[PDB]
Symmetry: D2
């Protein structure tokens, strides 16, 4: 199953200590990648290292703050010294008037991390950038507004970046999850969980593994002609 | 009737092309019109154009990238004419789009106070006119659409509408000197087989500003003769 | 004589499904804008009612019987209109099961559209405006009808564009009718909570958008679907 | 007595239009992933060629004659597959001027519907299914081709999403793959100077291979894609036409 092998590649997965990010990190490791998972605390990083080890995945856990040029540059250097250039990068890391700052800040962080890893990918003439959107289920109209805004911004961003870097055989894609069984979602009020479930044609929540498998495919050689795409993974619930 | 009499309209980037035609269309509908430019020369020209067409208002200097210029300009308008209740925003892909949306946000938030007091408003965002160019164009359009929809959601309960107009190939100063080969290829992609006039964008704007469009919000109306670039 | 200074003076407009709600309001708006209006219904009773409504509002035109599913009724109604009033250059289409519904409706749009295109091609001018349906099983049907209508409208606009005919659609959200006014208080409040403007739309608010799309000012708008939904977007 | 885990082994897949290009590559990819594959064509000649291609590649299955525009041919074909091999739980539907778009799209969607409804009964009883619709590749070069292409894609997206909704509660997914410019007969025979302008519209700077579509289909068919439904995955090297 050679079009699925990630053997020989180094993959950076931001926000990898739990839920979707962790499952992505294990799916890339299982496919044969060396995996570097990041968290914002030392506690998170150590826990990533442990989870990788317990699953036989070589790599590391480390601390990365995607909002800081310094942390990004420093982290990339660490990865280069110890393991080599990451050619697969997965970016995974409420009031009504706050949607603008959240989305703007997040896209600025995708941009900052994407640009820093592009140089290595340009040299290698090969790359995979995969952006993970946010999980559904924020409270109120404020939550639906923020959710729709983040998704539209992510789609346009992903498509433009794919265009900018395409000639270098780097693909850029996104995955837009729906209602997925995670820490955040299990702790939602039961009424809110039940109302969201009632809107899912498949009649169940997604597993974190079901996002990871899509990411694993996008990282593979078999997805080499897929770029600029946003793959929704939402059991048929399309929230606009 | 569908008169804009008694309303004050601010149109940014109003010294030429699409912005100037929007300014005159709102004036023709009876609005008091404040048009902006980035130089004193632009502002003066706007004032002269308005006068020559019988439109009351003013030309002024506004830099949408500066909090200070925005706050100051609005203050001048408020002292002298009242709150603008109709605002039309007409003034490396990543930096361009990010900068522009941060500007829409900045201007939009400052004019929202006046609109919230009046319980009524119209915000209309004008997208940019039609590989590097296609990428930039598609990026600016996707960002504008999501932005317009989200802001509409945030201000809707206050009877303020927020909409966008996405122009295609329009006859302006930028487009008037494009090489013949590029013009011909573009025409071949336009079902109506011609460029749009600046007036044709202005009429869409004039309708979105009206009472009849009061249930239209969050929309991006494409005005492109049937040429859709994604 | 008496000449309106409104945008549609001198034009003949056909509005299908005009005996109530959205269709009736579109018919009166086009009339108010100075068009001669032909409104259609599927029964003689509907047609007569349309005729009475138009007269009562000072609109010149007629109410007629049209079945958009029948080639014959279409061709025949068009001939009658051209003989008695002139060529209609403005046409507004307002007349588990989701597939049949959408497929049947798009086949009807195609049939009516093709028959009126000959008059519009001779005049080198036209407006075709398709009205989508008003808002689980209901959301699926609604999203399907809207996606089909959007792709259809854009493809037809491409096919006829070189003739200075525009083709556009209007996609309504929740509009105020008897069905909606009689919803229980809890259900109506939950509904309004999904609409940023916090209210239902009036039929007139759809009609004003149609009236604009029909005007000379909208000459460069084609292939578009203008949502009129108070900011509530479902797909 | 072979009990599979997380694979297509033992699943029966029906691939319409499987005698050449995209369809054939899909049929071999599903075979390689362990499915029993039934590939269809509209002629006996096509069917025979499918049978031979499957055999030569070590895939179990069959080539058959199916006309997706005919209720009779559909019902009859499904009956034959049921009697001899079992219910197909994976089904892949793969089977100029501006003014032809309506007939093409209307005919094709009616056919997706007809085939999809007939296979749903088997999938409902199994509580498991995969329906994958393949869009059309860019067909000619100017306006007429772009119109037709964009129309077929918009129809396919809305159709896929609505059907996904209708059948979701039965653990059947419905998805689509929208190819761009793929290396085929239509593309190979075209003028050389026009090929360079075409590539200039594709950020990856090349045409896609049929295998690159087949791999996306193979993933959508798998257990790992169980929460993907209603989606249209574009496979176009970054060239988006609408
Ligand atoms: F519209 C929006 F979702 F707020 C957004 N912000 C952006 C910032 C940079 C690039 C695209 C963006 N899109
Ligand atoms: F949903 C549907 F009824 F199948 C349909 N029919 C169509 C015909 C032409 C374009 C889109 C279409 N969508």
């Amino acid at each position: 199953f050679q079009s699925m092998s990630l053997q020989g590649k180094v993959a950076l997965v931001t926000g990898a200590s739990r839920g979707i990010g962790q499952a992505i990190a294990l799916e890339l490791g299982r496919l044969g990648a060396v995996v570097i998972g990041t968290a914002t605390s030392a506690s998170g990083a150590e826990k990533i290292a442990e989870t990788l080890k317990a699953n036989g995945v070589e790599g590391a856990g480390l601390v990365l703050d995607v909002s800081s040029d310094e942390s990004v540059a420093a982290t990339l250097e660490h990865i280069q010294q110890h393991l080599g250039q990451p050619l697969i990068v997965v970016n995974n890391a409420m009031k009504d008037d706050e949607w603008f700052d959240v989305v703007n800040t997040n896209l600025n962080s995708l941009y900052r991390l994407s640009k820093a890893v592009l140089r290595g990918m340009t040299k290698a003439r090969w790359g995979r950038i995969i952006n993970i959107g946010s999980v559904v289920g924020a409270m109120g109209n404020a939550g639906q507004t923020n959710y729709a805004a983040a998704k539209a911004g992510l789609e346009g961003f992903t498509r433009a970046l794919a265009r900018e870097v395409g000639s270098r055989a780097i693909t850029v894609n996104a995955v837009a999850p729906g209602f997925i069984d995670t820490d955040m979602t299990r702790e939602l009020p039961e009424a809110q969980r039940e109302a969201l479930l009632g809107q899912i044609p498949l009649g169940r929540l997604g597993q974190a593994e079901e996002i990871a498998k899509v990411v694993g495919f996008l990282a593979s050689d078999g997805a080499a002609y897929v770029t600029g795409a946003t793959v929704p993974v939402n059991g048929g619930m399309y929230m606009s």
